Amino acid sequence: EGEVTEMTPEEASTLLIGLKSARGQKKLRLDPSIYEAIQKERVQVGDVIYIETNT
């Protein structure tokens, strides 16, 4: 759970997402197929999201 801090495409692919909570933010490296599931949803700058890591 948490608020998106940045949407940074690293390679030119892998896109880091910082998930800010009320206890601290945390970097997160995404697969280039889970990002095409984030991107179908309309997540832009500071939307709170709920990423399942496993499924």
Partner: protein, 441 residues
Amino acid sequence: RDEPWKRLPPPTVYPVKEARFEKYIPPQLDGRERALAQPPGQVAIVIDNGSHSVRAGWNFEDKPRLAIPPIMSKYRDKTFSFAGSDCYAARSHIRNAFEAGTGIVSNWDVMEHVLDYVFVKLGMNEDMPIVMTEAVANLPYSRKSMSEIIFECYGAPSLVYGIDSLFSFRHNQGQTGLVVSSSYSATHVIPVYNRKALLSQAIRLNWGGWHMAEYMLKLLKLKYYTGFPGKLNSSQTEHMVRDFCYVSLDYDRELAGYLDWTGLEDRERIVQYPDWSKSLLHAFRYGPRPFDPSSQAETHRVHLNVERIRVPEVLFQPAAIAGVDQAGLVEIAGDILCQRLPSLPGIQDAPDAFLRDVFLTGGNTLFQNFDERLRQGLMALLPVGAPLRVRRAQDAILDAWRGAAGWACTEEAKAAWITREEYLEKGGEYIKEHDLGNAFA
């Protein structure tokens, strides 16, 4: 319905604590007799040039001798020109040595008489070194004029300028941290890396205790709208802020349900001076008790509900409450910790070192729940797992003097003095580059 004010208890009221005089004139001469008994090189007079309270004393003690405002007043009927706390705030021709709103001295005809009162009440009948504080990133003309008043008017062996918050850092036995000091004129944030201030990237917020007092005066001027029969001085509003304001932990939930009727009798703080149950404006101005019947000891009252948590909140949300177009304290601290210090070459660990000791120095800090708000803000900004430990100094308004007291007679201070012939040769704006003072020019 008579229920909401039938079983309501009688009020517990607090009087006005206006900054009046106090009946003391000591000509203390017992300090020079102890100062002339010590060996040379270990005697120096330390003056904290504070904007709210200039302090002065000798370095071999723990408490300062003189703690006066920079108030002077001169007039005539024989000419009286006394200064300091001897002014009663019943004649006031008061003008201050500091410019109103900024800790940069630009009223030198007042500062000369304030230093005159200091050297008289310490005892000078005749040449000691001077360690003196200043503000961060001081203007060169002010330092030139202060050095000219020290050498030419009085006659001194040497003086050295320093930042008082960094002296309180050096007395608190820290090595590397993020000194956040909320003073009377401005709130500084200074990162310190191995006993050295990184003054190329320190940030001052332009808010302070004087701004607290003036903004509290404006909100009590606009709250009591139809005319309040009473003299609304700035200093009595400052003493209201000193003992009736606290930084709230979770602000947007505390604020919106603050003026509810159920329990307003314990939130409200009331101040003397020498239908209605539906509207909130009666609860906002007057309280859950009924209206003022225009009595003697009823019209001359000031009620405080929102001003307890609205005025000390401007340090964190400045652009909305008071319209100062700058950033909050949490956002400045996060900008320095997360975006500048990892991008600076020459230092090893940006989160693992500066977060070991974040402590709070200045006088505008002794509010209930102020360190916890900053700790929750930095916990919301920093990555998970950083060992954050925010604390405060031991003697927050007096450690700025004690830090320069302990520093005054060491080898680094001896290698940073400016003697009289160095002032005669190098000029006026000469800077011994010490790790506490400003950058050399």
